[PDB]
Amino acid sequence: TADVQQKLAELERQSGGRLGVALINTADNSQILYRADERFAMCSTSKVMAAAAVLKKSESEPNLLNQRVEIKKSDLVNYNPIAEKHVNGTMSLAELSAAALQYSDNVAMNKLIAHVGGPASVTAFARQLGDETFRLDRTEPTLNTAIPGDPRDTTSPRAMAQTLRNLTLGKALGDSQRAQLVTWMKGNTTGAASIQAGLPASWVVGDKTGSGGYGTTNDIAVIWPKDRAPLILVTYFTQPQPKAESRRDVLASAAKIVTDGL
Ligand SMILES: [Cl-]
């Protein structure tokens, strides 16, 4: 509706930043879009693509998720909540995937990136899926700079919604792999203040947040409303000031606006 568009515009104005929304409603194959073709820095929302690349690789290397990866002091970056516990030991690729997806661990992301061949390989995987918008240019932590006008490490809300739909509800991944992705995302610990905060308590959510420079605050989610077909929602947000603070509440408000009435 022009109603929903007006509400999103007013939220954006009040926030002072730039808001991007894409909702796919699988009940009726409809969408709600707001700046959905503009680019936004993905920040840690890109961890979904990296984990999915490893899951895809595992379809042809069935013991891949059990492969051990050394964690060293030299691997530590800016945010290592899980990896810091494993320094001087190994983690499996499954553990790294879970740590990336559920704790936003940046070492874990770097190991997933490295495993599959680097940012250009993650990007090539996206292309193979039919996502011609996504670009992963850098590793952690530099992929979070989120400078306005910089296309590095960006995607659009429309592209990311379509890709997340494919990964979680479609056929990008084999059934075992898809189920594993969904279970990981449903176990996320970082998203309660973001999309989830704008949805009824009873709804089931798998999500991946991101945050970075310029107050960039993101979330991408698969949502199972009570007795309804699932939704896919991307809410990307970024601000004019380099040191702007996080605005998870804007994501919650956008989620509430676009799901009101469902
Ligand atoms: Cl509620």
Beta bridge partners of 6: none
CA 179: distance to chain centroid?
Answer: 17
Among candidate residues 215, 178, 208, the one with its CA nearest the CA of residue 105 = 208
SS3 34: strand
- Which positions are annotated as active-site residues? 44
Instruction: Report the separation in Å between the CA atom of 249 and the middle of ligand 1, taken as the mean of its atom positions.
Output: 16
Separation CA 116–CA 50 (nearest Å): 8
Amino acid at 172: A
User: What is the C-alpha separation between 62 and 57, in angstroms, rounded?
Assistant: 9
Phi, psi (degrees; rounded to nearest 5) at 41: -65, 125
Quick one: resolution in A?
Answer: 1.1
Which DSSP letter does residue 200 get? -
Q: State whether the Cα torsion 169-237-94-186 is positive or negative.
A: negative
Range of the domain at 96: 1-262
Written as one string, the DSSP assignment of 37-99 is TS-EE-GGGGHHHHHHHHHHHHTSSTTGGG-EEE--GGG--S--TTGGGGTTSEEEHHHHHHH
**Distance from the alpha carbon of residue 202 to the mean position of ligand 1, in angstroms:** 6
3-state secondary structure of 131: coil
Provide the CA 17 distance to its chain's centre, in angstroms: 20
CB 113 within 8 A of CB 122: yes
Give the separation between CA 44 and CA 160, rounded to whole angstroms.
13
Exposure on the CB side of residue 107, measured as CA atoms within 13 A: 25
Q: How many CB atoms lie within 10 A of CB 67?
A: 16
β-sheet bridge partners, residue 222: 206, 232
Residue 195 per-residue DSSP state: G
Residue 57: HSE in the Cβ half-sphere, 13 Å Cα cutoff? 24
Distance 141 CA to ligand 1 centre (A): 36
Q: Which of 237, 235, 193 is nearest to 215 (CA)?
A: 237
What tokens appear for 178 in the block?
């898809």
Give the Å distance between the CA of 191 and the centre of ligand 1. 16
Q: What angle do CA 170, 216, 193 make, to 5 degrees?
A: 70
Contacts of 49 (CB under 8 A, 6+ apart): 122, 125, 126, 134, 136, 163
Determination technique for this entry: X-ray
Q: What is the CATH number of the domain that holds 168?
A: 3.40.710.10
Name the pairing type of β-strands 68-70 and 154-155.
Answer: unpaired
Beta bridge mates, 237: 19, 217
One-letter amino acid for residue 166 of the chain: N
Three-state secondary structure call for residue 100: helix
Give the C-alpha separation, 130 to 40, whole Å.
Answer: 19
CA of 193 to the centre of ligand 1 (A): 14
Contact (Cβ atoms closer than 8 angstroms) between residue 97 and residue 52: no
Domain count, the chain: 1
Burial 83-93 (b: 16+ CB within 10 A, else e): beebeeeebeb
Maximum C-alpha span of the chain: 56
